[PDB]
Design a protein around this ligand. Structure first.
Ligand SMILES: [Ca+2]
Ligand SMILES: [Ca+2]
Ligand SMILES: [Zn+2]
Lengths: 96, 96
């Protein structure tokens, strides 16, 4: 058996593979769907802060402008989210 | 309420702080410990291939050489792991 940590990481890959296309990449409307379905509290925090994260996230995370989100671009996206929570845990405000 | 996804992220942050002692960063011995307790299979997989990941992980990831791993350096570490497991999902062997 694998530790929780290991399990947790595999989960993200499983999550990824729930929204990818044949090419192992996620298109924009799917990426938005993914966001809405899996990080709603995060989003509600940005909108309450007056920020609509979904408006440009795709545009900011598609670093190579291939109109697709690959796993690495995907990793970065999660990175930004984790990061916001971290700052939160040291007091900081959500979406900051 | 929190999705599986959100909780999983918060968990990573919790795991992180477990090894920070009273401050906000992880020393080398603490990181190695974190690795052994939370990624044993990834580790064994590495050893089986004849690779001891622990040998330079700290050195590889302390990008700013302050001889501590801050949350950002940490996320990069977990990226390398996540990335390995991604590839495994496409067949490939652990620790490659
Ligand atoms: Ca892209
Ligand atoms: Ca450092
Ligand atoms: Zn894939």
């Amino acid at each position: 058996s694998n530790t929780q940590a290991e399990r947790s990481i595999i989960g993200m890959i499983d999550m990824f593979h729930k929204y990818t296309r044949r090419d192992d990449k996620i298109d924009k409307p799917s990426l938005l769907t993914m966001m809405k379905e899996n990080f709603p509290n995060f989003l509600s925090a940005c909108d309450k802060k007056g920020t609509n994260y979904l408006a440009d996230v795709f545009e900011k995370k598609d670093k190579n402008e291939d109109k697709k989100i690959d796993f690495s671009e995907f990793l970065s996206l999660l990175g930004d989210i984790a990061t916001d929570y971290h700052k939160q845990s040291h007091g900081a405000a959500p979406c900051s």
